[PDB]
Amino acid sequence: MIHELLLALSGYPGSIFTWNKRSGLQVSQDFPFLHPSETSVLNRLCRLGTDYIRFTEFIEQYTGGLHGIYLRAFCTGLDSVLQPYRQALLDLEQEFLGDPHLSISHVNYFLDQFQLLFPSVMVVVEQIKSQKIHGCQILETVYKHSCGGLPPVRSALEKILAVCHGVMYKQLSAWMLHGLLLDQHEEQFSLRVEILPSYIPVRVAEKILFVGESVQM
Amino acid sequence: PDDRSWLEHHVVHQYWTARPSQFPHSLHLHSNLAAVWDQHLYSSDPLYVPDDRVLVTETQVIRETLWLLSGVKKLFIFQLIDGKVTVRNNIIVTHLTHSCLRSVLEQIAAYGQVVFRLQEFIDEVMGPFRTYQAFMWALYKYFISFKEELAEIEKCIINTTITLAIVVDKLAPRLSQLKVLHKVFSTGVAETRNVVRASHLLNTLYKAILEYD
Amino acid sequence: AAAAAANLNAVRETMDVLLEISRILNTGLDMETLSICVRLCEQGINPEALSSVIKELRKATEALK
């Protein structure tokens, strides 16, 4: 039972919980020795694992339309937010090994901070899917939600933004030192003004352009 | 008796030959989940001919997997279908509901096929071009370092506790690095002249480095 | 046997619990002394007598400090 969950929370559907695009991981199995209210608890618990499966699908396909290396910075940051969710899967097992019995409520209880984290990153991933980013415009739609209102999802996206700046410092290291083009194929010649972040002021970006252009001459 | 009993004690060879093993444990639902699910089915009236599962323990199944994963082939569990490893359906420990099981072993078997095919590439070199030999030598230099960690884990199964959820996370930095070889090699196994056969292979690698530059 | 060694396992667990209860309420006694106090509490004993003894033997080394 307490390894059934540790795979049902992981990316494996099972015969107990039925994954669907209509409503994923619906418990349809009943035992006579269960109280009939355990299914509602199980719905609240299955919210967690449904979100994890959704994230895993979206990571699996990646890493004009949605192209470029930028989504392969977003997916890598999304690995980093999921990384203490895997450690927090190990800790449950470590508790389980010694204790003779445990109740579902404690697991439900302990993983409540990711009932804030997960839907509020689900909004971010769906907004990035429905629209198309091929510029440097991933930074806007993460930075729209980095202001946040709930404190775990405020630091979660900080992870992702630091990663995407790490990708940006390859473009802006070959550019600003070597004066090179094709540090990434987009979608004299200079950066397209439309895809530039507005929280970077435009004058500063022009200064960057001049510094890069001087190496050619 | 006298040899069979002493075998049964020391050697493990009984969950896959005569007298399939029975595992007594702590019972009651927390790791007795397979038996509860079976009883649930039996109450639910299939009705007859129970599902054939031979009852292997878990830590063992970890050993058989690590042997398959290291790169030595031909184990009894996980039959071939054309040379492709597939999950065997008599496996059950005392829980794991037999359906999540059949998915998770499939996932790891999919990673085992990736290394299987590379060892197949090499095994047909032992039963000239000189680029193929250098290729194989690179693969092997990677391979031995991969196999060493798995081989170390195998001792530690006897030792602590070792389970599926631990070995999956522990092998995370390897199962990352296998997925790229499955894509790089898939164009290096798909083709006549020795000069186009060399250029096309070098070109895959030369492209793949600039891909994540 | 083995089931007679599992009783001693359920005592070694139980004592770890008693040590945790001892530390979250903060006594100045450690595990070695506490085990003797557990021996005493097995026969059934009143602490209105025992606490005076502990606060006395800790008062019998202030002049030998």
């Binding site: 090994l97 003779p100 | 702590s26 927390h30 | 070694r12 004592m15 021996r39």
Partner: peptide
């Protein structure tokens, strides 16, 4: 007697097939 015995070392061999401190 019991706390005299209690100064022993207990098993660190654990299994996932039992949860009541497997020996």
């Amino acid at each position: 007697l019991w706390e005299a015995a209690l100064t022993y070392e207990a098993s660190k061999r654990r299994c996932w097939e039992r949860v009541g401190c497997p020996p």
